[PDB]
Amino acid sequence: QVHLVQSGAEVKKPGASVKVSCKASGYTFTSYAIHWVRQAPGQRLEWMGWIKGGNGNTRYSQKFQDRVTITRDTSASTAYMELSSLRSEDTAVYYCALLTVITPDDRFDIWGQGTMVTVSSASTKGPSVFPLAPSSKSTSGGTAALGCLVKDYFPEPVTVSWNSGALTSGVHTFPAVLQSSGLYSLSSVVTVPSSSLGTQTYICNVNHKPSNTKVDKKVEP
Amino acid sequence: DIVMTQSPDSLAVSLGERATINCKSSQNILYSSNNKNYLAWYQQKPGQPPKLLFYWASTRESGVPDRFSGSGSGTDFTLTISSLQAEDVAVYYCHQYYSSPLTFGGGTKVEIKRTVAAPSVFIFPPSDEQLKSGTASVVCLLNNFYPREAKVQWKVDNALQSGNSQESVTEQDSKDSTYSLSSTLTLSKADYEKHKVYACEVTHQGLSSPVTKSFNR
């Protein structure tokens, strides 16, 4: 399958630079151009530039040409976007994408998963992860609710999966909230059958790449 | 630059009803030589990149359900969902590739109207792990309710709390079109140990009186 895979979430101080990678597979890397697109909070998608996988020619948005450089490495089937002289307003999700490939022989449109980049002078902090255990106060009607509290981290994002992604039915991972301290917290909860609390194991997998935090918390009665 | 403007910014229709999204481009993007409109439609769900649905204004991508159709010409374009399904809730974006820079519209958020559903309410005391670490957070969970508006109040020893809680609501569920909400009462461990009864009181359209869940520390 045509697939684009981006490097992980980033945190930078103002004035620094960031470089995001985009690893391509499932098609002939030199045949098509990879685009970079920004999605800032509450803002529209903004095109940044493109690069041809073959000859490496580029075209940049004249909003970004000043600070953006796009490159590619055919032997690695990878494209890169480097944005320099970072400003806190560069905080956004950055996408690479094979935008609207329309050929006689091929027609598709494929995006990487996005890379969150936060630019801030505030201190990075990894989360504490606490269980939200199932009890009679969260159990009724045949179902039990349980979860994980991910408390006091900066910046976004935290990701949460359950049982390494094998448990998704009934999972609610809520949007992060801000504490008065300027740190974030979030909750993830799942509803499961109360009848199988004794035989099943529930583990929340908490990832906070900016602090290199990777936690697996077993949640039990 | 060609500016892409969408209308409305937001719409809510009942399941199975028609949904109409409009896009206007500030310049003509129809090419008389081939009679093609240089426009695409994208669908974006939370945590996902946009998913292309239409090329050339009206050519469906492989596998797009037939209830979707793209139409229009020149500067005025329309995305129509003839029978809105729960899985269709998303933000929809138009896109022009007629001139450089490539540009996108501001998006139209599409939501589902459905029947009233009361929240299921649950309360979680502070974990022993958190207390050993020196703080205490109490979580009140409101699960799978509709409409989105819901009011949570915290009461400690029957005293109404103010200024020490935070809450957030999910996006609309892509299967049952409901919402959920989590509220956290953030206390110092010292203050948590000063009181006995911890309660969260929930008001919602599906409830004829507020519902309170509580525990004794």
């Binding site: 151009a33 329309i102 | 090419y31 081939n34 590739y97 007629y98 001139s99 450089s100 490539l102």
Partner: peptide, 14 residues
């Protein structure tokens, strides 16, 4: 009228 270098992925002679 269309810029064929807006997006090289779009057949410039379609």
């Amino acid at each position: 009228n269309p810029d064929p270098n807006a997006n090289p992925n779009v057949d410039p002679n379609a």
